[PDB]
Structures are given as structure tokens and as C-alpha cells.
Amino acid sequence: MIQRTPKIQVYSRHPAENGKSNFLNCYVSGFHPSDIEVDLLKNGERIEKVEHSDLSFSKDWSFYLLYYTEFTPTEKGEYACRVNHVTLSQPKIVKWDRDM
């Protein structure tokens, strides 16, 4: 058996084909087992519509999830990614930094 804690990165990207649009991303990487719960939050509230959830695995059966959706950040509000995993004794909340 192996278990590996997910690394969690929260960042924003503009797709080059539509640069005015902006996407909030939570990249959850290197985890095992694959069982997981991942949400994007706005002001602590689950964002129910997340357009993209792309899961894959590597040769060593570590899993990778990109969880992302279109958003429009202003100076208002707090955005985050919340992850629950067996390796994590409490849910891990990683806030989005507007400079990322």
C-alpha cells in the first residue's frame, strides 16, 4: 500500500484564444490513493459549477487533478481550494493569491 499527500496549487490563467476570460485553477498533484474531495470556494461557499475536472495518473500511480472554471476576480471576495484526502487530518484550504 502507498499513500501520498496531495500538493495543492491555486492560480489563475487566461486562455490565449480568449484572453479577456480568466480561470481559477486548483492543481492537486502527486496523491494516492485517488479517493479525494476538491472544491473551489468563494467567500467559504462551494462553487457548484466547475467547468473542468481533469484526472490522470503517472507510472507510479500518483494521481493528478486539474480543477478549474471561469471566474471574474475583483478586489472583492476570497477564493480558495478545499481538499479532503485520507492523508489530511483536516480539510486543507489553500487561498488564491490575486498575484498568482
Residue numbers in the entry: 0 to 99
Provide excerpts from the study.
To examine the structural effect of other amino acid substitutions at this site, the crystal structures of seven variants (D76E-, D76A-, D76S-, D76G-, D76Q-, D76Y-, and D76K-β2m) were determined at high resolution (1.15 to 1.52 Å). Comparison of the crystal structures of D76E-, D76A-, D76S-, D76G-, D76Q-, D76Y-, and D76K-β2m with those of WT- and D76N-β2m revealed no substantial differences that could explain their different stabilities and aggregation propensities (RMSD < 0.6 Å over all heavy atoms). For D76N-β2m, the network of hydrogen bonds involving the sidechains of N42, T73, and Y78 found in the CD and EF loops of WT-β2m is maintained in the variant. For other variants, the loop structure is maintained despite these hydrogen bonds either not forming (D76A-, D76G-, and D76Y-β2m), or being reduced in number (D76K-β2m hydrogen bonds to N42, and D76S-β2m hydrogen bonds to N42 and T73). Together, these observations indicate that the sidechain chemistry at residue 76 plays a role in protein stability and aggregation, but the behavior of the variants cannot be rationalized by their crystal structures alone.
